[PDB]
Amino acid sequence: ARMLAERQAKVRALVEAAHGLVEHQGARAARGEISADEARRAALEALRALRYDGSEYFWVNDLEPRMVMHPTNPQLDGQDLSGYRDPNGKLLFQEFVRTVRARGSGFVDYLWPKPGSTVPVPKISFVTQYQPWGWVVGSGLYVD
Ligand SMILES: [Zn+2]
């Protein structure tokens, strides 16, 4: 059974929620209520704090690509990701940026550890963009 389109739909749906949260903050900056900086910090505070289905999480990177906020591997924060490869050599962050720059959003598969461990395992993530800040927002499921 497969059965996996359903899980991908749920990831897609949670990432769309994260897109909503980000647009909501951006809109407030646009109307001049908070500075752009406050808006970005409020979005990151919510994304850093949120989990779903237990330990599933969101991260944010920019278009360089450079990490903005990663909640389970925070040592990546501010690091240049161009050239970051998983163990099969995949430039996965470059592929996120190409996908959103070319299609607006979409699924990208790659190898990445589960929270709390270090062995990269098969992952399928939905990534989306918030263009006014040059952000990519993502979340994925672990195939196994
Ligand atoms: Zn509101």
Author numbering: 38 to 181
Text taken from the publication that reported this structure:
Periplasmic sensor domain (residues 38–190) of chemotaxis protein, Adeh_3718 was isolated, purified, and crystallized as described in the methods section. Adeh_3718 crystallized in space group P3121 and diffracted X-rays to 2 Å resolution. The crystals consist of one protein molecule per asymmetric unit and there is no indication of oligomeric interactions in the crystal as determined by the PISA server. The PAS-like domain of Adeh_3718 consists of two N-terminal helices α1 (residues 41–68), α2 (residues 72–87), followed by two small β-strands β1 (residues 96–100) and β2 (103–106), helix α3 (residues 110–114), helix α4 (residues 128–141), β3 (residues 142–151), β4 (residues 156–167), and β5 (residues 171–180). The structure of Adeh_3718 sensor has revealed a fully occupied acetate ion moiety bound to the protein in this binding site. The acetate ion is bound stacked between two tryptophan rings of Trp96 and Trp149. Salt bridges are observed between the carboxylate group of acetate ion and side chains of Lys160 and His107. Two additional hydrogen bonds are made with the side chains of Tyr94 and Tyr147. The methyl group of the acetate is facing a hydrophobic pocket lined with the side chains of Leu129, Phe130, and Phe133. Although PAS-like domains can bind ligands nonspecifically and acetate binding by Adeh_3718 sensor may just be a crystallization artifact, one cannot rule out the possibility that Adeh_3718, which is a chemotaxis protein, could be involved in sensing environmental acetate by A. dehalogenans.
Many of the HK and MCP signal transduction proteins span the cytoplasmic membrane and detect extracytoplasmic signals/stimuli via “sensor” domains that face the periplasm. Binding of a small molecule or other stimulus to these domains initiates a response in the cytoplasmic domains, which in turn triggers the downstream regulatory processes. Although sensor domains have been studied for many years, there are still many unknowns about the actual ligands that stimulate a given response and the mechanism of signal transduction.
